[PDB]
Ligand SMILES: CCCCCCCCCCCCCC(=O)SCCNC(=O)CCNC(=O)[C@H](O)C(C)(C)COP(=O)(O)OP(=O)(O)OC[C@H]1O[C@@H](n2cnc3c(N)ncnc32)[C@H](O)[C@@H]1OP(=O)(O)O
């Protein structure tokens with residue numbers, strides 16, 4: 001059933017995943033010295049290429065591959081259009097490894113054919129709370145705690161093969177080469193997400209969407225109008241009214257995050273993330289990189305009253321090409337990022353996220369049901385979509401957890 005995934009150190013079935021009781025590695029211990037020093041073999045008409053993702057022109061070359069060949073829906077209505085600025089932000093965080101950015105080009109004329117990218121992340125990925133309780137009940141606490149320390153691993157994203165090269169077994173070669181380059185730096189686990197079901201997720205959540213510009217969403221067929229709206233004289237007017245928002249934020253003291261806020265935002269974020277079974281650990285440098293505002297890319301606001309930062313939220317921008325429509329070229333989506341609330345309820349904090357995103361010309365707000373995202377769905381008028389995000393580890397046995405026990409946002 002899976003000619004490639006059956007050869008890899010991942011759980012092979014749900015059932016297998018149902019026997020997993022402690023976090024830990026799948027494969028035998030290996031050293032850097034055991035890992036091939038030469039690149040994985042590839043056909044003579046192709047070559048490996050390491051783009052420099054801080055150099056405008058190489059970022060542009062990767063941006064065009066993804067614009068034309070990255071994820072699209074099944075009806076081919078929308079395709080992601082991650083911006084050049086977003087790609088530099090996502091793939092060059094503090095201490096990134098340039099060698100983990102891996103491309104294939106056609107050797108004759110250098111046509112870009114494929115990409116995959118890894119970045120470092122410091123992840124809490126030890127045995128989850130409900131399984132540590134089982135371990136206590138059995139006298140097995142030492143084995144359950146073995147891998148509690150946060151681990152320096154690889155986050156994989158942006159796997160893409162050109163549409164003309166589909167179904168030729170190029171993605172397995174990309175994945176093996178990326179695994180070799182990560183292993184040559186003495187890293188042995190990765191985390192990744194996909195919409196598709198592969199062997200075997202440790203967590204799965206539905207996507208949720210909150211309409212900000214419902215007339216455009218309906219025009220482009222992102223949205224339909226629920227059937228009940230047909231009992232009105234003016235279904236579209238009633239839909240627009242339903243999703244109307246304030247024109248300015250409601251929380252006293254909301255403002256954009258600035259560099260001086262980094263230590264307090266780090267403290268309140270890390271205290272909050274600690275409560276989830278799987279979640280990242282960020283240094284000051286990483287808080288600065290992932291949360292300070294960046295035009296067109298990431299938007300972050302703190303609540304400061306009386307000179308103290310008590311809450312914050314962030315969102316990022318991923319546009320999509322609207323493939324078929326004649327009225328619109330782009331869908332402008334805002335995605336819920338990290339947040340923390342200590343002074344107000346989360347619904348009250350996230351309402352201001354929707355207000356700011358709407359004021360800035362976003363069409364929809366998207367999120368997965370990770371973190372405490374379920375706690376504001378109904379009041380803030382999010383609805384579940386048809387999509388899911390499934391969370392996977394490479395070379396890590398892990399019990400199944402609920403998506404509300406995941407605190408890692410994946411771009
Ligand atoms: C320690 C360090 C470890 C580092 C590595 C950790 C692992 C990272 C793993 C990657 C995490 C990526 C996270 C993201 O970026 S998820 C986003 C993935 N990108 C897209 O969806 C963009 C549009 N599609 C494409 O570009 C191609 O269809 C891709 C490249 C997806 C497959 O190309 P193609 O369609 O031309 O097929 P093939 O003949 O070459 O290969 C077929 C094999 O590929 C398996 N396949 C299909 N889709 C995925 C998928 N999303 N993740 C993993 N495997 C996938 C499939 O089951 C089959 O294996 P098996 O069923 O036969 O066994």
Ligand SMILES: CN(CCC#N)c1nc(N(C)C2CCNCC2)nc2ccsc12
Nearest residue numbers: 071072073078079080222320333385386
């Ligand atoms: C590239 N974009 C646009 C993302 C946004 N905003 C996609 N949008 C949707 N949708 C907008 C769904 C939302 C729920 N209803 C059906 C369309 N589904 C998929 C599935 C694979 S990619 C993709």
Ligand SMILES: CN(CCC#N)c1nc(N(C)C2CCNCC2)nc2ccsc12
Nearest residue numbers: 071193194195207318366387388410411
């Ligand atoms: C249904 N999927 C998963 C597709 C894949 N892989 C979606 N993914 C994202 N993303 C931005 C993903 C893209 C892949 N990396 C993680 C985020 N946005 C939306 C918006 C509506 S549906 C949807």
Ligand SMILES: [Mg+2]
Nearest residue numbers: 167168169170
């Ligand atoms: Mg292929």
